[PDB]
Amino acid sequence: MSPILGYWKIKGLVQPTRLLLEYLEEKYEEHLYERDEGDKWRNKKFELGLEFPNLPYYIDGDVKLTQSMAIIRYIADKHNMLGGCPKERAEISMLEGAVLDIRYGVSRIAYSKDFETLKVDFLSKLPEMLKMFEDRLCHKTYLNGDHVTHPDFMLYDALDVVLYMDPMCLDAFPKLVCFKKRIEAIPQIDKYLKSSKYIAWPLQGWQATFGGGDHP
Amino acid sequence: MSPILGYWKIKGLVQPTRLLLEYLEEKYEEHLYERDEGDKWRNKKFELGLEFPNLPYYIDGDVKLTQSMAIIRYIADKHNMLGGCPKERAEISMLEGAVLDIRYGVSRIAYSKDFETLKVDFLSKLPEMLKMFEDRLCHKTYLNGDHVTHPDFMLYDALDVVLYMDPMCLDAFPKLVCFKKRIEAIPQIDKYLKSSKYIAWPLQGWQATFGGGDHP
Numbered sequence A, B: 001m002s003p004i005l006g007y008w009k010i011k012g013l014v015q016p017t018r019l020l021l022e023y024l025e026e027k028y029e030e031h032l033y034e035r036d037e038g039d040k041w042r043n044k045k046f047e048l049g050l051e052f053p054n055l056p057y058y059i060d061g062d063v064k065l066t067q068s069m070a071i072i073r074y075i076a077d078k079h080n081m082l083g084g085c086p087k088e089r090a091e092i093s094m095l096e097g098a099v100l101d102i103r104y105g106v107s108r109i110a111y112s113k114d115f116e117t118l119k120v121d122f123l124s125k126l127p128e129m130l131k132m133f134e135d136r137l138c139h140k141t142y143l144n145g146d147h148v149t150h151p152d153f154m155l156y157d158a159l160d161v162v163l164y165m166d167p168m169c170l171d172a173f174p175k176l177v178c179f180k181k182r183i184e185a186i187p188q189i190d191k192y193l194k195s196s197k198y199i200a201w202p203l204q205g206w207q208a209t210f211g212g213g214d215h216p
């Protein structure tokens, strides 16, 4: 029985997890809830055996999990990708948080009716955040070295998003522009992005002022 | 040389980490920035050797970290507390996220000038969130069983906070009311709470509409 990954039919908080699964060439099925299926989900919420019911969820022969970060880390952990010692594991967790500051930075304002005003102060702070990654990649191929790790897919997802907000936010960051291409040059990812499973939009929930709607 | 833990002189995102250090009886020094030291911190931000400068930070003979979650997990990891296998480690990470939904739920609205209106919709959703923990503790002493883990201190910190917002939010949750007492009955914690190091207020940054100010 193939693992089930439930979530809205958007990119949201699970996009990075989808990408890690594709990368590892893991098999899995998806329980996607359409914009109007809110009710279809509420009637199942407390019937799946989840100790902490929420979206996304991940169910397979071994576990039943919720909290998108617990899920991506589990899939990575099952492939010995979380780090070989305390120090390395803390390096990888530091990369997770730094990426989330960016990604969550967008979500916290993408639902306000004053998006444009908020979008201005945000983009004034985004640069400092990007440059930390720009330097981290000065001599590395990927965030943790020569081998891909899950924070790589999270960062990719964050760049894909801040680029919709502002197509020029990476002009001063060549290594990040390259990092983004390099992730797409990975065989498994390129296949996925061109397959029928890829969900290109929306970025956030359909009702958001930014990254919302049924079409780009 | 004792590990240094830097942060504002508030509870904020580091309170749970302080508590884990006390519990493990680890020695450490703190670099606390007063309300008016914002400038004292900006002039040091890019001079500590941190790959991703931010508050809090943790510096000792082995690592230099940022991102509060990477730090608490490191201190726990160095004591073999993160879980003995993939499944257990995902259980503990699931507990982290579920706690943060509550804790971050407060911060996301504690800075708005319309706190009271927001505080109403929040408290209407808090119950469902608390009950997941209320059930998780139905037969367990602590969140992961008979032994304390870091999510325990995070949850404690979240209850201490939602209780200031509403002293009655735990009336229908006896196991949670007990969990909170039990954490305080732990020798090391009780000592800390009564020592000169404990910082009782503010909950958030001083400028917040809720949990702010120099006094309760």
Ligand SMILES: N[C@@H](CCC(=O)N[C@@H](CSCc1ccccc1I)C(=O)NCC(=O)O)C(=O)O
Residues within 6 Å of the ligand: A012, A013, A045, A053, A054, A055, A056, A066, A067, A068, A069, A104, A107, A203, A204, A205, B097, B098, B101
């Ligand atoms: N921390 C949880 C948050 C889960 C969450 O916010 N779930 C939303 C969808 S993502 C909404 C979201 C939240 C924050 C940032 C971006 C986005 I998109 C939901 O509809 N849950 C189902 C329910 O509550 O019944 C996790 O990561 O799993």
Ligand SMILES: N[C@@H](CCC(=O)N[C@@H](CSCc1ccccc1I)C(=O)NCC(=O)O)C(=O)O
Residues within 6 Å of the ligand: A097, A098, A101, B012, B013, B045, B053, B054, B055, B056, B066, B067, B068, B069, B104, B107, B203, B204, B205
């Ligand atoms: N994800 C980072 C966020 C760090 C952060 O927000 N730091 C704030 C203080 S906590 C503010 C905060 C943020 C979110 C929720 C609650 C709270 I209190 C800061 O002043 N950083 C120093 C700087 O930017 O130079 C982490 O957890 O370390």
